[PDB]
A paper describes a structure:
The Marasmius oreades agglutinin (MOA) is the holotype of an emerging family of fungal chimerolectins and an active Ca2+/Mn2+-dependent protease, which exhibits a unique papain-like fold with special active site features. While acting as a dimerization domain, the papain-like domain of MOA retains the characteristic L-/R-domain partition of PLCPs. As additional feature, the MOA dimer carries two binuclear metal-binding clusters, symmetrically placed at the dimerization interface (Grahn et al., 2009). MOA requires the presence of calcium or manganese (II) to switch from the inactive form to an active protease (Cordara et al., 2011, Wohlschlager et al., 2011).
In an effort to validate our substrate binding model, we co-crystallized the enzymatically inactive MOA variants C215A and C215A/H257A with two synthetic heptapeptides mimicking proteolytic substrates. The designed peptides have the sequence PVxRAHS (with x = P or V). (2016) for subsites S4–S1 and S1′-S3′. The P2 (‘x’) position is occupied by either a proline or a valine residue to address the MOA S2 specificity pocket preference for both amino acids. To our surprise, the co-crystallized peptide probes were cleaved in both structures, despite the fact that we used catalytically inactive enzymes. The observed cleavage products correspond to the N-terminal proteolytic fragments, binding to the MOA active site in the standard backbone orientation expected for PLCP substrates. The synthetic peptides are anchored to the active site through three main contact points: the oxyanion hole, defined by Trp208 and the backbone NH group of Ala215, the ‘site B’ Ca2+ ion and a backbone–backbone interaction with Ala256. The presence of an arginine residue at the P1 position unambiguously maps the S1 subsite to the carboxylate group of L-domain Glu210, which forms a side-on bidentate salt bridge with the Arg guanidinium group. The P2 moiety binds to the S2 specificity pocket lined by residues Leu247, Ala258 and Leu182# (with ‘#’ identifying a residue provided by the other subunit). Substitution of Pro for Val at the P2 position yields a minor conformational change at the P3 and P4 positions of the peptides, and a lower occupancy of the bound proteolytic fragment.
Author numbering:
A (entry chain AAA), C (entry chain AAA): 2 to 293
B (entry chain BBB), D (entry chain BBB): 1 to 4
The structure:
């Protein structure tokens, strides 16, 4: 099954993602194919998939930016029916906004079926143009048609996945304890993590004994990423990944505070020094506490 | 040690 | 002995505190007697006392606001010698800025002796006026003279004192772990703690599932008090007290994040809800983690 | 429970 999470949904035939046009929250905003840049935040092209209780493999798809839902216009089963952004809720019974998402016949891409109409999300004519129509269309679960096949590029981790990434790190102290705060996290490209740091005012901040030392920098950076999350996105039900760690050196006679993020493949953590914006695989401390 |  | 810490230094004879005039960092700024308001931050009247290694009962006294040191002008032993703010360092060998501070004959107030001159800090003529001269003056350790007696009203806690206050609270979970970040903390009046919250932008913030929920409010409030500390004070070697806690309810089926501060008498913690600015003795959760 |  598709897991709860945030996805960048990419056509199997051409490099077009599912895009809410101009990120608009207006009801009836067209959802279109659009080109994308890997290893960025594609602002209008992220979708939170919420599983529906007691309906197998069926989800709402909420645009992270607008907070509006993928909606099959009037639930029509006619081929060519508009797919738009529309106001809704995460656990709606409105079948216009319910989508059954299961693996295609290639076992890697998915098909997206409207629960009401039983028609499929279709990049019409496989058009690679920016702004190409996406429609509900006749189809089957088993056919090869790439117009109706979609790669669900997972952009989020669960708290379980974040925990596993920390646990396989070689710089964790014997006494380590972690404290999980949220359930599902958007993983930032380092380019975006760096931009939030650059815009926080921390690059200008001076180290001062106790009054603005390592713990102040690390907590400020976590607060800055929290503020950015709320200010940037209108959807709810996820957080932005940014951890704080406390660490102790090999000799056991110095301790530090710093941040951490996750690799592109979501498998490993990377340390971030908020005093200088550096990313490190070894920050010279073993972590004895984290909260994230 | 103290967090510094 | 006087402990390392931040003090509001109040004359034993009249309600005048030791005040760095206008908080000025200029060398030779007069240090004067001035009236004060209890249960506020008296901005020009806080002094960080740093003990000198291997010199018994001897300290530098750094004005928290200016970052400049109490200085006996040219170290003169003449009665009436100016006491001023002057640039220095926490562990100076400059005897103009070194002060032996021991209990007076009443066993509650102190006398303040310049280490070089062996004269005493004196509120001249016991003048209660705002801006009254404070001078180095002839005296003895044992005499009753209230012009030369000073109550050292302790405004800070050690991390050991903060730990003891948490430990005697009745709302601590069996599994509690605390993580100390700094050594010596200025304890805020609730009026100041509230002002920092009011000026943080948190009063306007809306609760949102995961993306700005309890953990975001509590970490934002700690970051806001950290920023206020660095921006407000020029001295180094202390922090502002503001804790984050994670808690779990009696039933063990809900958890929350919130802040905490300390009572006036420094003996107990008080919980702070950053979602509504309320202070509580019981916030309906038992703390299983804190960092402060 | 989750911190909420
Ligand atoms: C190139 C073209 O691909 C297929 O046709 C698709 C359409 O396919 C879908 O709709 C048709 C009916 O129009 C049929 O139900 C099919 O099973 C279903 O997958 C559709 O994707 C549209 C819009 O993008 O484009 C093409 O017309 C195939 O059936 C055609 O024979 C032909 O190979
Ligand atoms: C009211 C007055 O109090 C005392 O005199 C103080 C001064 O006391 C100090 O200096 C004198 C010498 O001038 C002497 O060395 C004394 O032991 C020492 O405490 C001083 O505090 C000044 C400035 O504030 O005010 C008074 O002159 C006392 O000795 C006087 O007899 C008289 O009772
Ligand atoms: C917020 C906005 O994002 C970008 O423009 C979007 C655009 O973004 C995608 O397409 C562009 C090329 O037009 C790039 O490939 C980006 O990497 C894609 O994410 C689309 O989403 C369209 C249609 O909804 O809206 C634009 O606003 C960027 O070019 C803007 O400067 C700006 O940052
Ligand atoms: C920062 C400044 O603080 C106050 O003025 C100070 C003044 O503060 C003390 O004396 C006033 C009465 O003049 C009150 O009792 C305060 O409670 C005291 O802390 C002195 O420190 C003088 C001399 O250095 O400087 C003033 O700036 C306050 O009145 C101002 O509005 C302002 O907040
Ligand atoms: Ca949470
Ligand atoms: Ca600190
Ligand atoms: Ca510290
Ligand atoms: Ca959160
Ligand atoms: Na429309
Ligand atoms: Na389901
Ligand atoms: Na002067
Ligand atoms: Na000493």
């Amino acid at each position: 099954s598709l897991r709860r999470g945030i996805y960048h949904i990419e056509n199997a035939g051409v490099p077009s993602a599912i895009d809410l046009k101009d990120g608009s929250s207006s009801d009836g905003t067209p959802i279109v194919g659009w080109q994308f840049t890997p290893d960025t935040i594609n602002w209008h092209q992220l979708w939170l998939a919420e599983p529906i209780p007691n309906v197998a493999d069926t989800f709402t798809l909420c645009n992270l930016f607008s907070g509006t839902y993928m909606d099959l216009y009037n639930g029509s089963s006619e081929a060519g029916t508009a797919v738009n952004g529309w106001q809704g809720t995460a656990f709606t019974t409105n079948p216009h906004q319910l989508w059954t998402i299961k693996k295609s016949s290639d076992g890697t891409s998915y098909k997206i079926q409207n629960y009401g109409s039983k028609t499929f999300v279709d990049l019409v004519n496989g058009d690679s143009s920016d702004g190409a129509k996406i429609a509900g269309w006749t189809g089957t679960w088993d056919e090869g048609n790439p117009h109706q096949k979609w790669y669900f590029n997972r952009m989020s981790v669960s708290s379980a996945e974040a925990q596993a990434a920390i646990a396989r790190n070689p710089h964790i102290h014997g006494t380590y304890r972690g404290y999980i705060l949220d359930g599902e996290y958007l993983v930032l490209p380092n380019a975006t993590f760096t931009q939030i740091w650059k815009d926080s005012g921390l690059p200008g901040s001076k180290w001062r004994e106790q009054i603005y030392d390592a713990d102040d920098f690390a907590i400020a950076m976590k607060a800055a990423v929290g503020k950015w999350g709320a200010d940037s996105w209108k959807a709810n039900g996820f957080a932005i990944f940014c951890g704080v760690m406390l660490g102790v050196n090999k000799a056991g006679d110095a301790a530090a505070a710093y941040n951490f993020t996750l690799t592109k493949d979501h498998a490993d953590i990377v340390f971030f020094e908020p005093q200088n914006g550096g990313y490190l695989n070894d920050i010279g401390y073993d972590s004895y506490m984290a909260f994230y | 040690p103290v967090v510094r």
